[PDB]
Symmetry: none
Subunit: 247 residues, 4 copies
């Protein structure tokens, strides 16, 4: 029965993703329960700061979650070591910049600087990224010790998200080497259609690929020269950041 | 049924713990069987609020960032502060503004003016010079050392009025004064004939995300009105900032 | 106790009457004794909602202007429309914006984006090019003849995108199309990779005070999605405009 | 008893001048009456559009009053005949512009174009103006047939609003003539301290002073040359507008 816990986290997950607000009455009707017991969950969520109650007694998300996110981001020294180089990359390219943290066979958005114009990409901090269909991703898969690598191609599926999503490990391997060659990667609409990217890795103590920095924007912009320009500023900050990581 | 308590309580410990913790350690610390703690832990890991490392110890999960940013992105200080603003207008009768910080500029996110107050040209979604205003200067006074140093290194301090501070060094002094004063005053620095008293609104990290202020005809702003005015501002400003997690 | 009815009813007649009226005429028309009508009239004149001319005939009072402007000045279309906006987002899952007209520019007064929608750089209190957007073009389509002629005579139609209309004559055509179409569509005219469908919000005088729109990745905007999308917009737009007295 | 009418107009006057909103409960407590009878007034006010009821059942002013004001303003042809010249005067001076309608021994603000900066003046449409302590006012009192004039000085008090508010009819008369001379007036902080103005009249069919147009701003700006400049653009539009009034 103790999995009441589940119910709690379902109600909360709902208020966070809910556009606007919600009344005690509405949550009850939502999760088959009396207004009385809804108050059981809502009063604790409110007291803990996960939710804010309006003068009209309707509910809105609180600040707690915001504080929690910062605490977790606060655990990645790289974030503070890079943030400004990212803001600079955005001011010198005008393009959105991403920084993905390497976590196993997945990546996580740990920082993002929006560009001058909105781009048809759905990314946000905390979100996860496929290390194969993305530039900063392959850029990372192009330096993981061969051993670890070999296993990735062995485990991770390659469900093609777009007609350009590489689904063959022999091509992906060669692809990765090309990246080792140039020293960066390119996402020719392999992750999201309409969007292309350029990425470079970030090494740590023992030169392991612990991060990925990339420039993202609409396909139109990424020309041969543009690419050369982006990967240029990218590698420049990469090297500087990597240094801080004791490399 | 208030296990909801231990749940968020265990979640709070993990998020605020720099290192990690094992299920048994959570059990010992929060006084419960290893089987019950595995329950809180099985669900928190389930919803992604927690991550279990190879060595089995737990650390906070990525979902907290996902939720954090998603919430911050749609948080509305205006919907939260408005009534306080209206209130500020009931105890002073002078128009009131709320300014949001947008880098090195401020945005007017709300304004409560009374029938008796001065009609102002300022309107929602209008830029605010951070250096020539009380709310803006209040925001500057608390900005992080490095950022303020930067502000002064890039922003042009135009002479819009005879009183406008135009010397970065003279301004930094003003801020250090405001910083210690607790509030700022616009002595016809933004506009001629108009004065303002402004305080900052802090977020949970203590960052000056915005400022509230009172604007009126210069004359009305006497040493005693200002002290009177400011006090009202902070009072309502603490409430707002507290609701932001401060 | 519903004499409150005849009162505003008599007030309504006077305000909407181009000429004047005497107490006896109000009595005859609204079926009452000359003494009772003098009562409604004594109070309306009292509160200044009515003025008695030298020839004794009555005409509307200056207070109606005083109240009118005081109310207009603080009317908040955003507080009025917001929930509708949230609603627009529940039936389309695509971010939604509300744009206020500020002369020849538009101001973003609100935006409801969903977890599934495209993260947009646009934010409250940000300028909107009226010629390169769906909400903005919707506002143009209904602007008063003389004003639009003027708009085209002073505004620079920059080529921000390959699709942006830059020919005043070509634009006026688009508007006449939108005017008759009932809504507007931003075919990657504002930004590349993004499309929008937008309708106007009218005030009581039929003036396009603002516009609501749906924004999403260009691809998603198919002939059927657009028709689907627009319909939702007007539905919610009529409600808003109706609450503005339209 | 029928003066329930009074109560109605007191409640309404209150919601209009009330910052924020009000609940049925609050109005009742405000005007000593049961929530039940408050609904009597609030339901009609709502049905007539004078008030708007929120989802939270709290009340906010409606659009009706806005519509009513326009209808009354709609009765002064001069308004539409001048409005643009006013917008032009503001764009060519950067100063706030006013247009007061002559109504007996008082004036009424019938149009106003705000300037680039907020000025310490409290003016709004519909408001009334003393025809003696204001520029557009004296500018009008400088052309009213002497007969009518003589009576004004005879009736209207001159309660000095500021150390510069003329309280002597002999000085006011001479003052007025100076105005007839120059062809315009000047408010050296005679109406409001901190504020100075420059005004010119607007004549009708039989050349009667039916209106007043003026430029308003902080005292600092009104220099000998500035004044000359303002009264220049002022008289220019005046003449043009007056023409339309069949003059
Ligand atoms: Zn990428
Ligand atoms: Zn200020
Ligand atoms: Zn658009
Ligand atoms: Zn004046």
């Amino acid at each position: 029965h103790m999995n009441t816990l589940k119910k709690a986290f379902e109600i909360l997950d709902f208020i966070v993703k809910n556009p606007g607000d919600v009344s005690v009455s509405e949550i009850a009707e939502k999760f088959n329960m009396s207004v009385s017991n809804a108050y059981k969950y809502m009063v604790v969520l409110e007291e803990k700061g996960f939710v804010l109650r309006k003068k009209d007694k309707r509910y809105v998300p609180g600040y707690k979650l915001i504080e929690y996110g910062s605490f977790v981001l606060r655990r990645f020294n790289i974030r503070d070591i890079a943030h400004d180089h990212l803001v600079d990359i955005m001011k010198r390219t005008g393009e959105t910049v991403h920084l993905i943290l390497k976590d196993g066979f997945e990546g996580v958005y740990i920082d993002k600087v929006e560009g001058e114009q909105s781009i048809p990409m759905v990314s946000r901090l905390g979100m996860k990224v496929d290390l194969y269909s993305t530039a900063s991703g392959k850029s990372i898969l192009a330096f993981v010790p061969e051993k670890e690598l070999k296993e990735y191609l062995k485990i991770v599926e390659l469900k093609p998200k777009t007609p350009n999503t590489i689904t063959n490990p022999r091509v992906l391997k060669r692809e990765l080497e090309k990246i080792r060659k140039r020293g960066y990667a390119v996402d020719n609409e392999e992750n999201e259609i309409g969007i292309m990217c350029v990425g470079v890795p970030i090494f740590d103590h023992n030169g392991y690929p612990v991060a990925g920095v990339s420039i993202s924007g609409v396909a139109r912009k990424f020309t041969e020269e543009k690419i050369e320009e982006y990967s240029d500023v990218l590698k420049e900050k990469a090297e500087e950041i990597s240094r801080k990581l004791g490399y």
